[PDB]
Scaffold this motif. Structure first.
Motif, short mmCIF file in Angstrom:
data_model
loop_
_atom_site.label_atom_id
_atom_site.label_comp_id
_atom_site.label_asym_id
_atom_site.label_seq_id
_atom_site.Cartn_x
_atom_site.Cartn_y
_atom_site.Cartn_z
N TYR A 93 0.79 -1.24 -0.12
CA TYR A 93 0.05 -0.17 0.17
C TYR A 93 0.99 1.27 -0.04
CZ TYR A 93 -2.97 3.78 1.76
OH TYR A 93 -3.71 4.75 2.06
N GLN A 94 0.54 2.33 -1.01
CA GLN A 94 1.34 3.46 -0.88
C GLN A 94 0.63 4.58 0.00
OE1 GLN A 94 2.98 4.48 -4.81
NE2 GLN A 94 2.45 6.77 -4.38
N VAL A 95 1.53 4.89 0.82
CA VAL A 95 0.98 6.06 1.95
C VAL A 95 0.79 7.34 1.25
CG1 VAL A 95 2.00 5.00 4.07
CG2 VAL A 95 3.13 6.80 2.76
N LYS A 96 -0.06 7.97 1.48
CA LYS A 96 -0.38 9.30 0.69
C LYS A 96 0.26 10.44 1.43
CE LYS A 96 -5.21 8.68 1.13
NZ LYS A 96 -5.49 10.11 1.67
N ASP A 97 0.41 10.48 2.66
CA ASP A 97 1.20 11.39 3.54
C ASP A 97 1.34 11.23 4.99
OD1 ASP A 97 -2.04 11.35 3.43
OD2 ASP A 97 -1.72 12.60 5.33
N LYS A 98 1.97 11.85 5.53
CA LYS A 98 2.36 11.33 6.97
C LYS A 98 1.29 11.05 7.87
CE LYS A 98 4.96 14.33 9.68
NZ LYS A 98 5.36 15.03 8.60
N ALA A 99 0.40 11.72 7.70
CA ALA A 99 -1.15 11.25 8.63
C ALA A 99 -1.38 9.74 8.15
CB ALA A 99 -2.34 12.16 8.34
N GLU A 128 6.27 12.21 -3.61
CA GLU A 128 5.13 12.58 -3.38
C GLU A 128 4.82 12.85 -1.74
OE1 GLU A 128 3.00 8.96 -4.43
OE2 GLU A 128 2.50 9.50 -6.29
N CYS A 129 5.65 12.23 -0.87
CA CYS A 129 5.96 12.52 0.51
C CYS A 129 7.10 13.02 1.01
CB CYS A 129 5.27 11.23 1.31
SG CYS A 129 3.89 10.48 0.75
N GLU A 130 7.35 14.00 0.51
CA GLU A 130 8.84 14.53 0.81
C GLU A 130 9.30 14.71 2.39
OE1 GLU A 130 9.72 18.13 -1.43
OE2 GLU A 130 9.71 16.88 -3.37
N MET A 152 12.24 13.10 4.45
CA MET A 152 13.11 14.01 5.13
C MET A 152 13.07 13.53 6.66
SD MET A 152 12.74 17.94 4.06
CE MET A 152 13.09 18.84 5.21
N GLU A 153 12.02 13.01 7.19
CA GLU A 153 12.10 12.60 8.58
C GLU A 153 12.71 11.21 8.64
OE1 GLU A 153 8.54 10.02 11.34
OE2 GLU A 153 7.80 11.57 10.02
N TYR A 154 12.73 10.44 7.59
CA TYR A 154 13.67 9.03 7.76
C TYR A 154 15.24 9.26 6.94
CZ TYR A 154 9.62 6.57 9.57
OH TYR A 154 8.81 6.13 10.47
N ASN A 155 15.39 10.58 6.68
CA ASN A 155 16.59 10.98 6.02
C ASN A 155 17.17 10.14 5.00
OD1 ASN A 155 17.34 12.81 8.54
ND2 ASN A 155 16.67 11.07 9.74
N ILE A 156 16.25 9.83 4.24
CA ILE A 156 16.63 9.19 2.92
C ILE A 156 17.64 9.56 2.03
CG2 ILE A 156 15.69 7.66 0.81
N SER A 157 18.57 9.03 1.47
CA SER A 157 19.50 9.66 0.69
C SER A 157 19.74 8.47 -0.54
CB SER A 157 20.88 9.46 1.38
OG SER A 157 21.28 8.57 2.06
N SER A 158 19.90 7.24 -0.22
CA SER A 158 19.75 6.32 -1.16
C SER A 158 18.43 5.69 -1.38
CB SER A 158 20.94 5.20 -0.99
OG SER A 158 22.01 5.73 0.00
N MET A 159 18.29 4.98 -2.75
CA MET A 159 17.07 4.39 -2.90
C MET A 159 17.50 2.90 -3.71
SD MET A 159 14.54 7.04 -2.76
CE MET A 159 13.75 7.29 -4.02
N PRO A 160 16.62 1.78 -3.53
CA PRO A 160 15.50 2.06 -2.27
C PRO A 160 16.24 1.86 -0.93
CG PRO A 160 15.75 -0.33 -3.18
CD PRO A 160 16.58 0.40 -4.04
N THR A 161 15.23 2.41 -0.04
CA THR A 161 15.80 2.33 1.46
C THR A 161 14.54 1.54 2.00
OG1 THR A 161 17.04 4.19 1.38
CG2 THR A 161 16.51 3.45 3.58
N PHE A 162 14.93 0.50 2.76
CA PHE A 162 14.02 -0.42 3.22
C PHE A 162 14.17 -0.17 5.03
CE2 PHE A 162 15.08 -2.58 -0.58
CZ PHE A 162 13.53 -2.69 -0.97
N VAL A 163 13.28 0.28 5.45
CA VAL A 163 13.04 0.85 6.88
C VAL A 163 12.01 -0.22 7.60
CG1 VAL A 163 12.48 2.31 8.66
CG2 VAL A 163 13.68 3.23 6.72
N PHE A 164 12.59 -0.71 8.70
CA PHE A 164 11.57 -1.89 9.41
C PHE A 164 11.38 -1.35 10.68
CE2 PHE A 164 12.71 -5.16 6.16
CZ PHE A 164 13.79 -4.66 5.53
N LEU A 165 10.00 -1.34 10.96
CA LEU A 165 9.27 -0.86 12.37
C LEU A 165 8.66 -1.79 12.87
CD1 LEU A 165 7.87 2.61 11.07
CD2 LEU A 165 10.17 2.30 12.01
#
Length: 106
Positions: A3-9, A62-64, A68-81
């Motif tokens: 699922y693609q998130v539309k925004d931070k909320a 789309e969700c800049e 920025m919150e996750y400090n993305i520099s490289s792509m793809p970045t996988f973050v695991f929460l």
């Protein structure tokens, strides 16, 4: 089950909905070649582990604010929460790492 998130909320909502399951965040872009190569392997793993894992895609363009919150520099970045703990993170279209990290967190 990707699922693609539309925004931070929306992301925050998806995080709370995922509850105690592993959440995989895939930070990607539509112009990113390696992001598209790994896409099918990601989709597979999300179906493979539907009863344990929620995969969210975050279009960085789309969700800049999220990128920025996750400090993305490289792509793809996988973050695991997991329950608000950012348990692992790596970048690159590394199929083996992606699978290993998912399995290591379930």
């Amino acid at each position: 089950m990707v699922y693609q998130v539309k925004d931070k909320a929306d992301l925050d909502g998806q995080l709370t909905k995922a509850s105690g399951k592993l959440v995989v965040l895939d930070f990607f872009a539509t112009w990113c070649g390696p992001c598209k190569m790994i896409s099918p392997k990601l989709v597979e793993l999300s179906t493979q582990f539907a009863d344990n894992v929620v995969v969210l895609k975050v279009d960085v363009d789309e969700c800049e604010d999220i990128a920025m919150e996750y400090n993305i520099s490289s792509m793809p970045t996988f973050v695991f929460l997991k329950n608000g703990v950012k348990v692992e993170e790596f970048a690159g279209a590394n199929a083996k790492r992606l699978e290993d990290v998912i399995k290591a967190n379930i």
